Amino acid sequence: EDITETSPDKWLIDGDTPLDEVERAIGYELPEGDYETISGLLFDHANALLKTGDVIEIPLDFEPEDYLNNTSPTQRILRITVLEVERNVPVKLALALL
Ligand SMILES: [Br-]
Ligand SMILES: [Br-]
Ligand SMILES: [Br-]
Ligand SMILES: [Br-]
Ligand SMILES: [Br-]
Ligand SMILES: [Br-]
Ligand SMILES: [Br-]
Ligand SMILES: [Br-]
Ligand SMILES: [Br-]
């Protein structure tokens, strides 16, 4: 369907993948906003057009236990690379948990 885990902590996904679906796959919550798909998030974050080859890195939400014995935990980052664009929107994205 929408998401394929291609190697550990890496995925190929469709451009219209629902964000809840992406979150379930990667095991982390993403920032919420005025959008509901992975591409919507990307457009919101870049605030620009998205082109094949563009790489966008988005910080993932901490869980409460990430702060247990650590006042300054290190953010996990999701790297997203736009692999295919059609009609000015991404249709395939590479995701890597860094
Ligand atoms: Br798509
Ligand atoms: Br959207
Ligand atoms: Br960006
Ligand atoms: Br632009
Ligand atoms: Br393009
Ligand atoms: Br927790
Ligand atoms: Br393309
Ligand atoms: Br295009
Ligand atoms: Br990748």
Side-chain angles (χ1 to χ4, degrees):
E1 349 78 281
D2 267 16
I3 296 175
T4 305
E5 198 178 10
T6 56
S7 69
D9 292 331
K10 292 186 188 181
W11 304 263
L12 176 63
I13 75 175
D14 292 348
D16 69 352
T17 303
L19 284 168
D20 62 345
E21 206 153 296
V22 177
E23 296 176 337
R24 214 146 40 239
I26 72 183
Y28 284 91
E29 295 193 49
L30 281 154
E32 303 207 331
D34 189 17
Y35 44 76
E36 69 180 44
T37 71
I38 188 57
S39 289
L41 168 64
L42 294 182
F43 280 118
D44 188 277
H45 188 95
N47 190 27
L49 294 170
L50 301 166
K51 311 286 189 185
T52 302
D54 284 359
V55 177
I56 293 95
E57 293 181 3
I58 305 193
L60 295 168
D61 285 2
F62 290 118
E63 306 287 336
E65 64 89 28
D66 293 330
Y67 283 82
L68 186 71
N69 325 294
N70 192 346
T71 254
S72 47
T74 301
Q75 282 176 329
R76 207 83 189 265
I77 302 298
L78 181 68
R79 175 186 287 159
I80 306 134
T81 307
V82 177
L83 296 182
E84 204 165 83
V85 173
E86 295 187 5
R87 302 212 53 250
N88 286 277
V89 307
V91 297
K92 299 284 163 169
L93 297 170
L95 268 58
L97 186 63
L98 298 185

